[PDB]
Design a protein around this ligand. Structure first.
Ligand SMILES: Nc1ncnc2c1ncn2[C@@H]1O[C@H](COP(=O)(O)OP(=O)(O)OP(=O)(O)O)[C@@H](O)[C@H]1O
Ligand SMILES: Nc1ncnc2c1ncn2[C@@H]1O[C@H](COP(=O)(O)OP(=O)(O)O)[C@@H](O)[C@H]1O
Ligand SMILES: [Mg+2]
Ligand SMILES: [Mg+2]
Lengths: 54, 504, 469, 55, 127
């Protein structure tokens, strides 16, 4: 009985550790995409300001 | 008779006088001359200075003209005389270039002698339209067991070799030159192939090591190499991609077949960015100009499969692109991806895990599809592609798996043994009739009892057997093209005879 | 032909001539100073007005100082007499021992050799370091690179190859130091007198030295590396000897040209470098080659800025190097010294037709068990170490002994460690690693291989730890 | 993201390069386990009989 | 003091604001801004300041001069533009971490990362 009680709780506790790791994986995908656009925007201004002052 | 040939040249030289349309120099600096005068120069027209260097006029401005320099600017002083030639840039082309080393302008650098080519061709021509093309059907044989099985290349397709540094991108495109020797010494005229190799910004010692590799395999009698190295000037690394398609279009225009390799295109967008920002052009993303898409599109669109009314020629283009940290979402790795047809993605993780050549078949595609495979290769590899794709779904269960279903244990058992068939040593390109036999030994089920470490030793033993003792079966798959019912039984007892007494 | 100074902004001085215009890349002597100040021409601007870069400082310059011209670029003195002397960018001696008296003067600006003047033969040059000779062998007459960040050991590892290689070598040797600390050019002048390589009493020295350090104006940290490989071009060409060449650092050749750039009138490229970045780099790196008149071994240290090998200055030197030795801070913070990354170092002669088939299947056998050790760490973070099977509890314990066996106690790092200097030969490095892989040392703990020489000392160190229980 | 060549995909050996909580929990578990194996392999290494005759 | 036998010690607190004030003084002179609008030669700014902190020999006096520059970082980033120009100039580092501060070790010094060239092992004989 104890090896069935244990092997079913390994099924549930490894299931909520993949829901919480996929809930966390979308929130870092939005922050990765805001920051990816913000670096192309930032280093574009430095080239324009470098050429305008020249 | 060394004195006689020197006296011969100087009487055969032309010393005649002409007119000119000259103009003085205003300000030379960093390789951009500003010339005042030259009131009748066309755009992109070649001029030549007083010292001996040549120049290509890119900016036609109102009060001056911006002309890049084919050399170094220490010989250009302010107040020189810039004469006019009167013609756009042109390269020599023909059959005489086969087996020579040339720079970006057609001069000879190998020191054998000058080119005897009688024809001449512009570098700025256009692609053929929609009407003179036809769909790609003939196979272009590379000789790599993973390319011809899963990501094939037809004769007119553009296929991109993309990956990081030091992962065998040059080596995949250097045995494809070696593999076409078996057709290039035979009789069938419509199966020969001609290879061109363009080196854009590499050191001189590396090109001197690669010519010797192609001299050893007797594969420098049908190959041309165009070398614009790192020390040469910034515009000579811009012309050199367009100076190779003009030598690969003479074979397309005359009913022949060709192949070209750009090594690499990510060093042409850099040698062109330097020319832009010194001519004061408006920058853009990562300081590239607004027309870097128009730079690569009109070079790859010159690869075409012509039809029978124009000759039936072809031109196949393989560009190499180096990513940085495996990010293909950069500027230049997204321009050339959206132009071409499919990519071959060589990773660095699989290179050290033992998979060599390290082709990732999860991300590699080809959109001519299975219409460029022969009938023999198409029949066995259609199930192999489905078998490998079911393995990559369940690759994450291999590290801790023993309590799984017997179908899942079988799916792991075939996926490991199909992988060992795909590994291949360097400078050993195979034949399509030998390739289909090794795949037929694996996809049927004749290997699920052999130990996974022995699949390499079994394969080198089995291939040397069927070359000498079954030569009359590998002439009825080469000439037939398909694999019939008679050859299906004849191959069936062969791999059962060898597997029975094998371990000795 | 005299000329006047019309503008001074920073390190960029504008000079207007009247009747004779000197060409680009010349030398102009500023009359009126007590020191010697040389200006190098860089651009033309029209109406007889050039724009120069200054080799020394520009304080105390006034608009109207008459400037002479040389008619030739910076011609340093060169010959056999310059051995054992420190010299400046323009050729003045700064060792304070007198004038360098020689007969040959040579400009620092010259062309590259052609395609039919290249050599093609490859060899192997043995050093004695276990990580280098096993997985990424160096070569005679081949360009070698030492990557890595700040504070991982690029100056010590380039101090090790002067210790091993330069005294057993027949011919001469040249050390150019470009843009590094002025202290460390004194710990080389005092670690080469007490070893007898520099001799201050007669004519038997074997090392020349060229130094432009990080206190110089930025027009002088970009012409010192061209002055190093001008002395080292005399020995290869006018004589025939085998030359070495050590350069540290070479990132300070690119950076010192990214500072004078915006005042010369150029739009910046990507992250801040000049538009002509990959052209003047490739104009210097095509003179450091092996021709048909000699051979130049060359070791170079390459600073990688803030641990990013995708920066445009280190990621374009890769095309000019045969053997790359990528150092890493993730190994050095374990205590594994020298911190060389095995899964990121390559060579062009890792080839079973050159190093033999026995060395080749050992090198790839080490990288395959280290890379398979990487994918196993992702499981131990969730499962644990003990819940693994017994079959992959062994490939970890074989990998951890291969990580620790690569670390070797260096000789010039005695004052850091106190340990002694070891030098393992090539035939012993392969035979040490066959036996850990095959399983002939599964009865020892991991600590018996840390900082040892050959495999013989790995079991002598094993018993000495046992008795203190 | 990952269901295309363009988007970001994770490789092997990415928990240790991050250096977080799971990256520190893995280094102190490979050390606290292979510390006991330097005990059992060193205690049984003292059982060489020739050394005991020298003792 | 260095040229006349005696010894000295100088502390620059701090060297980041010495570059924010050199940026603004050089923008208004109409000079083109580089990376993060800093001028092109903010390496030559600091690398001639810290290169004069020498130690002389007995034929020139024997006096010394020792520096201790301070650098401020923005939320643990030791990979920025100015916090990495100086790190490749100095001889050691003392990485103060805010994660160690609120835990309770004061002065919070990351002893795993705070490296220094020892100085030909001239610590002392007793420590
Ligand atoms: N099939 C293979 N099996 C084993 N090793 C190989 C194979 N193909 C190439 N190599 C090795 O990989 C090394 C580098 O390969 P290669 O130079 O082709 O990569 P690359 O990325 O094109 O180089 P670069 O980054 O300079 O363009 C070579 O030393 C070669 O020996
Ligand atoms: N043999 C060695 N192995 C590992 N680390 C070393 C060795 N020698 C020096 N180091 C470490 O490298 C650091 C920087 O040394 P150095 O090579 O002079 O600097 P850099 O590589 O930044 O020029 C020192 O703090 C020292 O602890
Ligand atoms: Mg390559
Ligand atoms: Mg250093």
């Amino acid at each position: 009985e104890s090896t069935t009680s244990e092997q079913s709780a390994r099924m549930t506790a490894m299931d909520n550790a993949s829901k919480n790791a996929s809930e966390m994986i979308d929130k870092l995908t939005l922050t990765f995409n805001r920051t990816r656009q913000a670096v192309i925007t930032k280093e574009l201004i430095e080239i324009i300001s470098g050429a305008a002052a020249l | 008779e060394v004195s006689s040939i020197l006296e011969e040249r100087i009487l055969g030289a032309d010393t005649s006088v002409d007119l000119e349309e000259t103009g003085r120099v205003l300000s030379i600096g960093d390789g951009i001359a500003r010339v005042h005068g030259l009131r009748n120069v066309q755009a992109e027209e070649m001029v030549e200075f007083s010292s001996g260097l040549k120049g290509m006029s890119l900016n036609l401005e109102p009060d001056n003209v911006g002309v890049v320099v084919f050399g170094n600017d220490k010989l250009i002083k302010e107040g020189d005389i810039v004469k006019r030639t009167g013609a756009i840039v042109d390269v020599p082309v023909g059959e005489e270039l086969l087996g020579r080393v040339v720079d970006a302008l057609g001069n000879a650098i190998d020191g054998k002698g000058p080119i005897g080519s009688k024809t001449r061709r512009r570098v700025g021509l256009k692609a053929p339209g929609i009407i003179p093309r036809i769909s790609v059907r003939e196979p272009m044989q590379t000789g790599i067991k993973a390319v011809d099985s899963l990501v094939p290349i037809g004769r007119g397709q553009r296929e991109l070799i993309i990956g990081d540094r030091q992962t065998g991108k040059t080596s995949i495109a250097i045995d494809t030159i070696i593999n076409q020797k078996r057709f290039n010494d035979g009789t069938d005229e419509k199966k020969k192939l001609y290879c061109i190799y363009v080196a854009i910004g590499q050191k001189r010692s590396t090109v001197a090591q690669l010519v010797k590799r192609l001299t050893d395999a007797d594969a420098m009698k049908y190959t041309i190499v165009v070398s614009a190295t790192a020390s040469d000037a910034a515009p000579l690394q811009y012309l050199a991609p367009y100076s190779g398609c003009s030598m690969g279009e003479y074979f397309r225009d005359n009913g022949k077949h060709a192949l070209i390799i750009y090594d690499d295109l990510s060093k042409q967008a850099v040698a062109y960015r330097q020319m832009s920002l010194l001519l004061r052009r408006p920058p853009g993303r990562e300081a590239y100009p607004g027309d870097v898409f128009y730079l690569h599109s009109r070079l790859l669109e010159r690869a075409a499969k012509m039809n029978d009314a124009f000759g039936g020629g072809s031109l196949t283009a393989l560009p190499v692109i180096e990513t940085q940290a495996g990010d293909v979402s950069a500027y230049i790795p997204t321009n050339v991806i959206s132009i071409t047809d499919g990519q071959i993605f060589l990773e660095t993780e699989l290179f050290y895990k033992g998979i060599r050549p390290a082709i990732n078949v999860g991300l590699s595609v080809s959109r001519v599809g299975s219409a460029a495979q022969t009938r023999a290769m198409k029949q066995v590899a259609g199930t192999m592609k489905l078998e490998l794709a079911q393995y990559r779904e369940v690759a994450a269960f291999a590290q801790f798996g023993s309590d799984l279903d017997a179908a899942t244990q079988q799916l792991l058992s075939r996926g490991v043994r199909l992988t060992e068939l795909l590994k291949q040593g360097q400078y050993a390109p195979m034949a399509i009739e030998e390739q289909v036999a090794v795949i037929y030994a694996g996809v049927r089920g004749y290997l699920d009892k052999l130990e996974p470490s022995k699949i390499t030793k079994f394969e080198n033993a089995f291939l040397s057997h069927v070359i000498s003792q079954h030569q009359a079966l590998l002439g009825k798959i080469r000439a037939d093209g398909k694999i019939s019912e008679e050859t299906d039984a004849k191959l069936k007892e062969i791999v059962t005879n060898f597997l029975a007494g094998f371990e000795a | 032909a005299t000329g006047r100074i019309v503008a001074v902004i920073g390190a960029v001085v504008d000079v207007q001539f009247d009747e004779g215009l000197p060409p680009i890349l010349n030398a102009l002597e500023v009359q009126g100073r007590e020191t010697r100040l040389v200006l190098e021409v860089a651009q033309h601007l029209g109406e007889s007005t050039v724009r120069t870069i200054a080799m020394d400082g520009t304080e105390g310059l006034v608009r109207g100082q008459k400037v002479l011209d040389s008619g030739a670029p910076i011609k340093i003195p060169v010959g056999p007499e310059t051995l054992g002397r420190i010299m400046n960018v323009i050729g003045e001696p700064i060792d304070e021992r007198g004038p360098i008296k020689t007969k040959q003067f040579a400009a620092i600006h010259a062309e590259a050799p052609e395609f039919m003047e290249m050599s093609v033969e490859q060899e192997i040059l043995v050093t004695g370091i276990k990580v280098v000779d096993l997985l990424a062998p160096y070569a005679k007459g081949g360009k070698i690179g030492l990557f890595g960040g700040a504070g991982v050991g690029k100056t010590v590892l380039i101090m090790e190859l002067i210790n091993n290689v330069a005294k057993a070598h027949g011919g001469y040797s040249v050390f150019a130091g470009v843009g590094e600390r002025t202290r460390e050019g004194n710990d080389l002048y005092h670690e080469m007198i007490e070893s007898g390589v520099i001799n201050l009493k007669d004519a038997t020295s074997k090392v020349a030295l060229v130094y432009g350090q990080m206190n110089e104006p930025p027009g002088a940290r970009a012409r010192v590396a061209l002055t190093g490989l001008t002395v080292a071009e005399y020995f290869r060409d006018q004589e025939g000897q085998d030359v070495l060449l050590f350069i540290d650092n070479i990132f300070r050749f690119t950076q010192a040209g990214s500072e004078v750039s915006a005042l010369l009138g150029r739009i910046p490229s990507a992250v801040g470098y000049q538009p002509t970045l990959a052209t003047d780099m490739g104009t210097m790196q095509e003179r450091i080659t092996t021709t048909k008149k000699g051979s130049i071994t060359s070791v170079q240290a390459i600073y990688v800025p803030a641990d990013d090998l995708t920066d445009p200055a280190p990621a374009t030197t890769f095309a000019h190097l045969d053997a790359t030795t990528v150092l890493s801070r993730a190994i050095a913070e374990l205590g594994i010294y020298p911190a060389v990354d095995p899964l990121d170092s390559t060579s062009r002669i890792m080839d079973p037709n050159i190093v033999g088939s026995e060395h080749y299947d050992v090198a790839r056998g080490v990288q395959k068990i280290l890379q398979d050790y990487k994918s196993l760490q992702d499981i131990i973070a969730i499962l644990g170490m003990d819940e693994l099977s017994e079959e992959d509890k062994l490939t970890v314990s074989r990998a951890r002994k291969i990580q620790r066996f690569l670390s070797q106690p260096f000789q010039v790092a005695e004052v850091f460690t106190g340990h002694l200097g070891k030098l393992v030969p090539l035939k012993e490095t392969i035979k040490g690693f066959q036996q850990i892989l095959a399983g002939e040392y599964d009865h020892l703990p991991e600590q018996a291989f840390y900082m040892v020489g050959p495999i013989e000392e790995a079991v002598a160190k094993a018993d000495k730890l046992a008795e203190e229980h | 993201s990952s269901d295309t060549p363009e988007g970001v995909r994770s490789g092997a050996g990415a928990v240790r390069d991050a250096g977080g909580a799971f990256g520190k929990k893995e280094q102190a578990d490979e050390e606290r386990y292979f510390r006991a194996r330097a005990r059992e392999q060193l205690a049984a290494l003292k059982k060489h009989h020739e050394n005991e005759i020298s003792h």
